[PDB]
């Protein structure tokens, strides 16, 4: 009983009171330290108060607490468990930082060990312990995505060493010698003359001498700093300041292919990777919850309540029935509710609440605000009215048995106090009133799939206590990286620059509001900057706090996915299936209903023999595509050029043979909507030879059009207008949470009015508190240096996006949602002070929560629901296939994998010689040789470091010789082994060849530069992603799946070629510009840069700047050509760079979620039931027994065949000589010879034998159902028969 011996009971008579009273006491000890551990405030340079001597003298109460604790549960028993360790390493830390305090008085570093005692809250309630255990398992299928993720991290952090080693340490110096790098206020790189980079244009010059971009921290100097780098692009956050650099560095041209490639392959497929493999276990483990029957309960549940509501009222309309007035008043009033024109009026009165809510913004005229205020107060009455004409009529116990009706009760309840308190003069309109408008999703009843969103509730209040045991771990992983960030960084963020840090670690609430930016990712690395220079800096002992950074947000990010996917799948995988088990009622009991009442020279000749063959419809795809390509060749920057004459002129011979093709249609027939929109298309471009000098409003309306030429070839190119349609219905499906989501984002919007209408204003110098003072000139000074004063003008302007009305707070909480610049708009609308003055530094940080609970349930809630309903649908999609045969779709793969296998070839050849140094290459030992040898030339790669010596330069040039000699010396004996012939018929041995040829070259190029042969030596590293049987065949799969899968990246492809033509056609002429987000590196001048744009805007790095930068107001380009002083700029840039963002991402969901779908048959696998793994095998253990694919094996070897099978395949452990070969020999096999028994045969008997067994004479029931609905078998299994 994990006690054996027992100790005298004189002393050991603990266990008695320790059960109900001992298991309390400690955890309330524990909330405590909690609360004392958050009470703390740290100071900068041993600074304190009273409450911090207070709390490290109660501190001795808890450690003394906790000793006592651990001692009596120690004499208990000599600790084993793996929460009671934790708990006695806690205090025995504890103990070692007490004495050590009291001692020598770094110790205080001791103490962060503190922030682990909330966890040790995790382990006193085993219902929290559950779902931590829940969480944890999940991690051990992503391992292999971990591995991945190191190795491409690992890659591209050696290629990036090679090509930029140290070029970011050249700006430009202003002033005649090197004092305070007199570039603007953040320097860029820049290149010197004979450098591709770029070059200051100014009276300054480009010297060298500094420290690096972001204070030397980013930049591929060394292998650490080149690994943090690509993992911070690799996150998403700030790659393009990386790419920008570099850019400036080094030539803009050739960089791009590393970061687009990084960010496409170690970004959107690894999360694509992640999405499947959690898609994978999460329907596991529903699959898994049938056996426990929790659908069962929540449908009984379901059918029940309906019971009740129609007959609590049945008996009620009992009492209506006269066998006193009152029974008559009740009698009109119960059916004046049910009436069809009560529930409309009802409706309209909740559609003029709103309309009267959305009509409040920033300084509204006077009666305005008092015809809101009557029609408040009217509405108020008429629904406290409407909540007495239901109440009354169907009683209390037949009200709130309603779910809804417990909703509007609470809001109308809640908003008749909070109208009494505003207009008692208590505090401002928090906005409870607004919450009126969830009475609006009643439409959706007169509208189908009402129910649905029903059964997605009603799982939601089931489903309650996981979704709160869910919320209160990732509040405990939250607390606990808020305690240890601001043990770590409390008060080590005061530097001597002029803006002070908001993002710091000083407070709770302050620590508590950067960790939740960490989390959603949004600005980071500057944390982690600044964290990194709050030590020593880019050293090597303070360099080490950034992981701090990366394990919060490698396990915030993870828990996230299982917190708020889970919830989204498994409470869509109830209602839907739910809305699945009611629909057939619906449609049986009407049956049962219905069963019982009821009872011209224009022909293929010479005119359309070559139009409907594939040769011309094929024929004019490529000219599609050209006349595509002519279009986004266009310079939009100039007007009058010879490459737009060409085009220009292009298009005229195009569009010729584009209208020729249109009378060969006019006569075929008299039309779907496909052959008009052509057309129509080309009944535009003929406007394009009559404009003369009418290109004043015509031709900007007319250019702009031309983008509808790509999308006019779906119809032409079978699969993609089938994705098109595919691609619309799920658009269909989703629109239910779209319109959902899309007025919960309103009511958000609506609080956000009332919150902040007007105050968020603010003047330049922070000395002026209004508008009235904020006028005339100030003096600023330059760096924080009083000696270097400037005047500047007092400008008083708004947010960038602030809340002024309705619409402006929509885009700010659209921009907020999407989780760029967030961080900004939460602490400028901290500081709001009063509806028109200015900021006061920290006036409510409460207010936060308003940013943060949106941002729980419209960017982390929502979103994820809508992934998971995206999941789901495509699921039931995939799953409705009703092939219920016997086969139950596995048996079917296994049978098609046993007809569809043959013995692989031996190519054992003769010539001893040969022979022998094929065994000696084919042997494992030099396999791990090589993988030694492999990851010695990769640590050699990973070695070289800027400012290297010269001898090291040379000893890395002889190892790398050294390594390549013996790399070609392997590659020849290989060749010899395996022969010229076959040597190459591997996918691996051709690339091992070419880099070996490929590192030989530069070889000779190094005793004569050129490095895209270098990097070649790092590629056989990836040759180590070729062992683990796992990460090999989950990499091949997905690979398949994106192979099969084009047109849907097609979709994508099109959408970013059209966006760009449009703006370009658009934005393209705005001036380019330094402290703008339109520069040489963003704009619209050329169809790469536009590209590379929305590429930018579609990862959301600050797309939200630059629609502000794309505003009206902006002088352009002087290569395009009175009045043009800023006349030149659209307000398009809301739409434009909005909807792109909602539906590029939408088009990558439906890229993901597709290329998982056709990839559940391995996510959902269950490895330890036979599967074509297991069935692989056979065919490597026949190869050496078969010398070539033939059929034909011997007799007598089946006694190792029987031995060599796995015991999930064949047999266990047991003797061969039993019943295993009594019942391999007694069965029905081919009547063939004594050894002609081919190899299918074999293999099928072995998979009956395995499972899925029946009785004797059954056998032409598998024959004929091998040919039902098993696919075509081309009369192939004649030596099968039998
Ligand atoms: C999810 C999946 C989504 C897929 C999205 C793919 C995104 C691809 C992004 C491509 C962006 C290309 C930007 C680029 O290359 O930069 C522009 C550059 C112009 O360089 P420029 O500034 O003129 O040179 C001055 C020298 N100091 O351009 C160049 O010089 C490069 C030439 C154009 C790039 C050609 C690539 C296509 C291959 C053609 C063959
Ligand atoms: C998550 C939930 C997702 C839904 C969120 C919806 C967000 C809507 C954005 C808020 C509308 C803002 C309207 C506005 O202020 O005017 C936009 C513009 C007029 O320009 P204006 O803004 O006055 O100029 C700058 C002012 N200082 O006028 C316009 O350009 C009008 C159009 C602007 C709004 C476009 C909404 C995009 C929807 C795309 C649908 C995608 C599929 C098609
Ligand atoms: C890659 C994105 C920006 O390009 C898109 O356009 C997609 C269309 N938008 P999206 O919102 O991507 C953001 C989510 O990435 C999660 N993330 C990432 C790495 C990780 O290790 N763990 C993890 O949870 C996350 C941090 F939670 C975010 O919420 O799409 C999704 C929406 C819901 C669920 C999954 C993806
Ligand atoms: C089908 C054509 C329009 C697509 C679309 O319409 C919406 C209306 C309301 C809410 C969402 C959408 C929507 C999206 O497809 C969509 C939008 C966003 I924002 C979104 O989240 C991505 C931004 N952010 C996550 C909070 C990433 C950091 C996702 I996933 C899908
Ligand atoms: C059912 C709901 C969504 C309907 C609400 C629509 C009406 C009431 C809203 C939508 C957009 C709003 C406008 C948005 C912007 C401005 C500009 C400002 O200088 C004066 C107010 C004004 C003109 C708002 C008045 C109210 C408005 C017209
Ligand atoms: C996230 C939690 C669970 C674990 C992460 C470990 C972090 C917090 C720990 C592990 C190693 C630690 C570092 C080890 C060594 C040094 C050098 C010293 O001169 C200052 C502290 C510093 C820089 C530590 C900072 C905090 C640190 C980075
Ligand atoms: C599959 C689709 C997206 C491929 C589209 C390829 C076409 C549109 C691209 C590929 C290469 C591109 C060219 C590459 C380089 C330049 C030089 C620059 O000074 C003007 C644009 C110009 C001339 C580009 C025009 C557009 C272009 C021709
Ligand atoms: C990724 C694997 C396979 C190879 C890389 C692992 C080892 C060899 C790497 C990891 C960290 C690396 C070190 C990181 C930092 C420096 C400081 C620099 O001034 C000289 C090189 C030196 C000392 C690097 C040498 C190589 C190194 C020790
Ligand atoms: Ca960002």
């Given at each position: 009983l994990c006690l054996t011996l027992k100790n005298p009971i004189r002393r050991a008579c603990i266990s008695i009171v320790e059960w109900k009273p001992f298991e309390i006491i400690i955890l309330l000890t524990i909330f405590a330290n909690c609360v004392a551990l958050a009470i703390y405030i740290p100071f900068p340079e041993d600074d304190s108060n009273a409450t911090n001597s207070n709390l490290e003298r109660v501190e001795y109460l808890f450690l003394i607490i906790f000793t006592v604790e651990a001692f009596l549960k120690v004499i208990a028993y000599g600790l084993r468990n793996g929460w009671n360790l934790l708990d006695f390493i806690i205090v025995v830390v504890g103990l070692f930082s007490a004495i050590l305090e009291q001692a020598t008085k770094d110790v205080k570093a001791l103490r962060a060990f503190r922030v682990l005692r909330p966890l040790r809250l995790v382990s006193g309630v085993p219902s929290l312990q559950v779902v931590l255990n829940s969480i944890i398992k999940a991690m051990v299928p992503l391992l292999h995505i971990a591995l991945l993720v190191?190795?491409?991290?690992?890659?591209?952090?050696?290629?990036?060493?090679?090509?930029?080693?140290?070029?970011?340490?050249?700006?430009?110096?202003?002033?005649?010698?090197?004092?305070?790098?007199?570039?603007?206020?953040?320097?860029?790189?820049?290149?010197?003359?004979?450098?591709?980079?770029?070059?200051?244009?100014?009276?300054?010059?480009?010297?060298?001498?500094?420290?690096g971009p972001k204070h030397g921290i980013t930049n591929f100097d060394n292998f650490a700093f080149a690994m943090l780098t690509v993992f911070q692009c690799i996150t998403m956050?700030?790659?393009?300041?990386?790419?920008?650099?570099?850019?400036?560095?080094?030539?803009?041209?050739?960089?791009?292919?590393?970061?687009?490639?990084?960010?496409?392959?170690?970004?959107?497929?690894?999360?694509?990777?992640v999405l499947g493999v959690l898609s994978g276990e999460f329907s596991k483990e529903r699959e898994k919850a049938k056996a426990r029957g929790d659908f069962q309960k929540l449908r009984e549940k379901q059918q029940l309540e309906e019971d009740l509501k129609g007959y609590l009222d049945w008996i009620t309309q009992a009492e209506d029935i006269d066998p006193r007035w009152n029974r008559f008043c009740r009698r009109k009033c119960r059916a004046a509710v049910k009436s069809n024109v009560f529930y409309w009026l009802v409706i309209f009165l909740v559609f003029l609440n709103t309309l009267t809510i959305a009509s409040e913004h920033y300084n509204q005229p006077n009666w305005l605000t008092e015809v809101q205020d009557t029609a408040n107060k009217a509405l108020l009455a008429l629904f406290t009215a409407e909540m007495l004409l239901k109440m009354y009529s169907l009683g209390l116990q037949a009200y709130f048995v309603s779910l809804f009706n417990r909703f509007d009760c609470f809001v109308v309840c809640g908003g008749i106090l909070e109208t009494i308190l505003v207009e008692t003069k208590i505090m401002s309109p928090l906005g409870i009133s607004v919450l009126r408008c969830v009475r609006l999703l009643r439409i959706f009843k007169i509208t189908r799939y009402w129910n649905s969103l029903?059964?997605?509730?009603?799982?939601?209040?089931?489903?309650?206590?996981?979704?709160?045991?869910?919320?209160?771990?990732?509040?405990?992983?939250?607390?606990?990286?808020?305690?240890?960030?601001?043990?770590?960084?409390?008060?080590?963020?005061?530097?001597?620059?002029?803006?002070?840090?908001?993002?710091?670690?000083?407070?709770?609430?302050?620590?508590?509001?950067?960790?939740?930016?960490?989390?959603?990712?949004?600005?980071?690395?500057?944390?982690?900057?600044?964290?990194?220079?709050?030590?020593?800096?880019?050293?090597?002992?303070?360099?080490?706090?950034?992981?701090?950074?990366?394990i919060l947000f490698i396990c915030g990010n993870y828990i996230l996915l299982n917190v708020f996917l889970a919830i989204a799948v498994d409470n869509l995988a109830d209602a839907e299936s739910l809305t699945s088990a009611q629909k057939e009622e619906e449609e049986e009991k009407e049956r049962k209903k219905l069963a019982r009442t009821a009872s011209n020279n224009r022909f293929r000749l010479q005119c359309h023999r070559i139009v409907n063959d594939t040769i011309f419809t094929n024929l004019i795809l490529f000219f599609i595509l050209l006349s595509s390509i002519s279009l986004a060749a266009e310079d939009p920057v100039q007007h009058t050029s010879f490459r737009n004459h060409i085009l220009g002129n292009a298009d005229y011979v195009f569009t010729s043979i584009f209208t020729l093709e249109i009378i060969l249609k006019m006569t075929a027939y008299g039309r779907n909507y496909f052959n008009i929109l052509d057309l129509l298309v080309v009944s535009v471009s003929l406007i394009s030879f009559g404009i003369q000098s009418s290109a004043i409003n015509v031709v900007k309306i007319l250019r702009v059009l031309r983008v509808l030429r790509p999308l006019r070839a779906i119809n032409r190119a079978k699969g993609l207008k089938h994705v098109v349609q595919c691609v619309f219905v799920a658009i269909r499906t989703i629109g239910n949470i779209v319109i959902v989501t899309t007025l919960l984002q309103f009511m958000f919007a609506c609080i956000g009015v009332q919150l902040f209408k007007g105050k968020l204003y603010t003047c330049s110098d922070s000395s002026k508190q209004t508008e009235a003072e904020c006028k005339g000139n100030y003096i600023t000074y330059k760096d924080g240096e009083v000696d270097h004063p400037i005047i500047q003008p007092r400008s008083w302007e708004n947010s960038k996006f602030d809340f002024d009305n309705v619409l402006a707070a929509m885009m700010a909480l659209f921009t907020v949602s999407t989780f760029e610049g967030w961080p900004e708009l939460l602490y400028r609308s901290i500081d709001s002070h009063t509806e028109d003055k200015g900021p006061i530094y920290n006036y409510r940080v409460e207010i936060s929560i308003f940013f943060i609970i949106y941002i729980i349930i419209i960017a982390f809630f929502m979103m994820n629901i809508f992934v998971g309903f995206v999941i789901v649908t495509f699921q039931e999609q995939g799953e409705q296939e009703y092939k219920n045969c016997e086969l139950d779709k596995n048996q079917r793969q296994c049978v098609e994998y046993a007809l569809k296998a043959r013995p692989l070839r031996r190519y054992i050849p003769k010539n001893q010689h040969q022979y022998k140094v094929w065994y000696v290459v084919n042997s494992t030992y030099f396999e791990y040789l090589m993988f030694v040898l492999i990851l010695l030339n990769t640590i050699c790669l990973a070695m070289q470091h800027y400012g290297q010596s010269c001898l090291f330069k040379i000893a890395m040039n002889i190892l790398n010789m050294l390594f390549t000699g013996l790399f070609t010396v392997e590659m020849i004996l290989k060749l010899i082994a395996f022969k010229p012939k076959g040597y190459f018929s591997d996918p691996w041995n051709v690339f091992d060849f070419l880099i070996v040829i490929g590192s030989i070259i530069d070889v000779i190029l190094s005793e004569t530069s050129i490095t895209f042969f270098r990097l070649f030596r790092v590629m056989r590293l990836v040759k180590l992603l070729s062992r683990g049987e796992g990460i090999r065949t989950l990499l091949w799969t997905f690979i398949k799946s994106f192979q099969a899968l084009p047109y849907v990246a097609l979709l994508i492809v099109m959408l970013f070629f059209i966006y760009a033509v449009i703006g370009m056609q658009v934005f393209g002429k705005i001036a380019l510009n330094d402290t703008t987000e339109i520069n040489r590196n963003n704009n619209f001048q050329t169809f790469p840069q536009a590209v590379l744009l929305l590429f930018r805007c579609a990862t959301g790095e600050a797309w939200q700047d630059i629609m502000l930068a794309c505003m009206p107001g902006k002088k352009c380009a002087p290569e395009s050509e009175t009045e043009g002083e800023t006349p030149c700029g659209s307000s398009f840039a809301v739409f434009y760079f909005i909807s792109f963002y909602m539906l590029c991402a939408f088009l990558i969901i439906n890229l993901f979620v597709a290329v998982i779908m056709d990839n559940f048959d391995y996510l959902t696998r269950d490895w330890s039931i036979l599967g074509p793994h297991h069935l692989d095998e056979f065919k490597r253990i026949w190869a050496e027994y078969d010398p070539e694919a033939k059929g034909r094996i011997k007799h007598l070897d089946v006694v190792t065949l029987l031995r060599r099978i796995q015991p999930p395949l064949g047999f266990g452990k047991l003797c061969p000589h039993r019943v295993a070969c009594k019942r391999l020999v007694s069965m029905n096999m081919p009547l063939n010879s004594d050894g002609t028994v081919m190899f299918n045969a074999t293999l099928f008997a072995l998979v009956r034998t395995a499972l899925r067994i029946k009785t004797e004479g059954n056998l032409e029931q598998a024959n004929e159902e091998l040919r039902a609905i098993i696919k075509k078998i081309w009369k192939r299994t004649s030596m099968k028969l039998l």
């Open positions: 190191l190795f491409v991290i690992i890659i591209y952090a050696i290629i990036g060493l090679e090509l930029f080693m140290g070029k970011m340490h050249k700006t430009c110096y202003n002033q005649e010698g090197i004092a305070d790098v007199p570039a603007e206020d953040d320097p860029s790189p820049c290149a010197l003359e004979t450098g591709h980079g770029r070059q200051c244009q100014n009276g300054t010059v480009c010297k060298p001498g500094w420290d956050e700030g790659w393009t300041d990386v790419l920008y650099w570099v850019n400036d560095a080094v030539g803009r041209d050739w960089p791009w292919i590393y970061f687009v490639t990084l960010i496409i392959i170690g970004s959107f497929f690894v999360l694509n990777l029903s059964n997605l509730v009603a799982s939601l209040l089931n489903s309650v206590r996981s979704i709160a045991s869910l919320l209160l771990l990732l509040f405990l992983f939250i607390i606990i990286f808020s305690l240890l960030g601001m043990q770590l960084f409390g008060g080590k963020f005061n530097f001597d620059e002029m803006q002070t840090r908001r993002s710091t670690f000083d407070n709770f609430p302050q620590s508590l509001l950067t960790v939740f930016q960490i989390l959603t990712g949004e600005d980071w690395n500057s944390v982690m900057y600044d964290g990194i220079m709050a030590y020593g800096g880019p050293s090597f002992p303070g360099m080490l706090v950034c992981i701090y950074f990366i």
